[PDB]
Amino acid sequence: ALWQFRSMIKCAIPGSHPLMDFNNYGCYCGLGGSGTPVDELDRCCETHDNCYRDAKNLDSCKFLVDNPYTESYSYSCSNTEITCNSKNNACEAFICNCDRNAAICFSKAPYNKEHKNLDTKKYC
Ligand SMILES: [Ca+2]
C-alpha cells in the first residue's frame, strides 16, 4: 500500500510529505510523471512501479482490482525504521517488500535533495 507505506515514509524522513518530496522530483519519484528517472534515488521510483505493479499478476494475487498502489501494511516506526506487515501471503507481503525497500531507498539511498520540483525537459 501507498498511503499506508507513506505514513512510515514521513517517519523514514524526520520529515513531512512522504511523496511530494518525490511526486515532482527529477521526473516522477513515487507518484507522478512518466518514462525513466534521473538519480540513484529516482531509480527505486522506476522500480516502485516495476516491482509495484506485479501484485496484479502475482503467484498469490491474480484477479481484478490491485494494479498500481493498494495491497499491504500493518507496521511500526523506530528512529526512522519500521517493519511492514503482520499477516502475509504474497498479496500483502510481496507488495510490502517493494514498499519497505523503497522506504530504504527513500529515507537513505545515494540520495540528492537537490533536483526536487523539476519540469521534465532538462529533467525528463
Ligand atoms: Ca513513479
Side-chain angles (χ1 to χ4, degrees):
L2 196 271
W3 72 82
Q4 230 173 337
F5 113 116
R6 270 27 266 213
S7 190
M8 13 168 292
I9 291 263
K10 68 71 162 176
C11 183
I13 287 101
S16 186
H17 23 256
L19 259 162
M20 294 147 282
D21 191 70
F22 289 91
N23 184 3
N24 276 23
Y25 198 94
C27 330
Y28 38 52
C29 231
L31 154 56
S34 189
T36 5
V38 323
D39 216 67
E40 209 83 81
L41 198 250
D42 296 88
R43 305 309 316 274
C44 305
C45 301
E46 191 206 300
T47 296
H48 208 251
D49 270 348
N50 309 316
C51 70
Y52 204 8
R53 107 268 263 241
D54 201 86
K56 113 288 242 297
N57 180 39
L58 200 51
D59 278 278
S60 205
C61 257
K62 196 181 188 290
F63 76 115
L64 279 58
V65 294
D66 59 281
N67 287 66
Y69 299 169
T70 21
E71 292 281 81
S72 196
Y73 276 79
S74 175
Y75 64 98
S76 276
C77 179
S78 297
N79 279 338
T80 55
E81 292 187 90
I82 297 116
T83 188
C84 87
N85 76 155
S86 62
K87 58 259 196 291
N88 63 277
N89 292 91
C91 288
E92 49 242 329
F94 164 133
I95 286 73
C96 122
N97 201 14
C98 276
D99 289 288
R100 294 301 331 302
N101 195 73
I104 277 35
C105 288
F106 295 165
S107 173
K108 14 147 322 188
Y111 219 75
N112 273 298
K113 56 56 269 181
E114 138 76 77
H115 63 67
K116 157 110 188 202
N117 219 324
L118 282 64
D119 212 300
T120 88
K121 41 151 206 186
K122 267 185 207 187
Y123 295 150
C124 264

